[PDB]
């Protein structure tokens, strides 16, 4: 039996469903992540994504910086709080252009029935994400220097 | 065994949500309430271009203007006597 097969039956769609892409697992983990969830309101997703990057940006600006050889973690603290606020400009300005009239997603599931469209892509959508990326980011940054410093 | 249907206008081209499972909230009762109320005033998109821009400049203009050797080597300034030029200058 072939490990690799056409995309959900269709062999004339630009993709190949490998055991990397489609499998018993991976289809369960990626849905567990904040962004891919369909039924939840647009507030709580942005916080769960936004917070996370506040810790991925936090470690960095401590040990490699100019004041690495000394204010080393105060130095690294608000600099992680920054790429947060710029992303918020990037994501608020990303939103400012795109959405003028109604959403646009692959409406159905793998099962193929017409499920309700997500608020991930809408006028009131990316706003609460852009807010989630801020309140998550700014607060989420503070806890990489209440634990490593204070 | 036919992927060609005008009435089925979405299955045809392959707009299949690959890993978009329609599951319930695994997120907690107490914690989801902590972070709805906390992240609901900053929600609006118009308020971000007013807050993030002007308060972000207020973040640069605070930690930017606050001037000694303690944190950077320029507000430190020149801490030795001037060097001699090429055309006998000061």
């Amino acid at each position: 039996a072939q490990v690799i097969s056409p995309v959900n039956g269709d062999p004339f769609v630009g993709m190949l469903e490998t055991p990397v892409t489609s499998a018993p697992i991976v289809a369960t983990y990626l849905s567990n992540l904040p962004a891919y969830r369909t039924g939840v309101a647009p507030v709580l997703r942005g916080v769960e994504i936004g917070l996370a990057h506040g810790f991925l940006l936090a470690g960095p600006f401590i040990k490699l910086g100019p004041l690495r050889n000394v204010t080393a973690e105060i130095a690294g603290s608000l600099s992680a709080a920054g790429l947060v606020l710029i992303l918020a400009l990037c994501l608020s300005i990303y939103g400012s252009a795109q959405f003028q009239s109604t959403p646009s997603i692959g409406v159905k599931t793998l099962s193929g029935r017409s499920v309700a469209r997500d608020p991930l892509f809408s006028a009131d959508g990316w706003s609460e994400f852009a807010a989630g990326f801020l309140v998550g980011g700014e607060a989420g940054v503070a806890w990489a220097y209440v634990c490593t410093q204070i | 065994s036919r992927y060609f249907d005008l009435q089925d206008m979405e299955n045809t081209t392959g707009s299949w949500d690959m890993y978009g499972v329609d599951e319930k909230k695994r997120y907690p009762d107490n914690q989801a309430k902590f972070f709805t109320q906390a992240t609901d005033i900053i929600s609006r998109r118009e308020s971000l271009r007013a807050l993030v821009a002007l308060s972000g400049i207020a973040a640069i203009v605070t930690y930017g203007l606050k001037a000694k050797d303690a944190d950077l080597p320029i507000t430190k300034g020149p801490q030795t006597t001037g060097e001699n030029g090429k055309g006998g200058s000061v």
């Binding site: 300005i93 400012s96 252009a97 | 821009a53 640069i60 203009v61 930017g64 203007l65």
Partner: peptide, 29 residues
């Protein structure tokens, strides 16, 4: 150190920051 502490980082960031922002919105919309 009074003037150039303010005007350099505003011309360095805050002028291009809102310029790249308000010119992006002029392009796409």
């Amino acid at each position: 150190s009074w003037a150039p502490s303010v005007f350099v980082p505003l011309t360095g960031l805050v002028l291009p920051a809102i310029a790249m922002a308000t010119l992006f919105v002029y392009i796409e919309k």
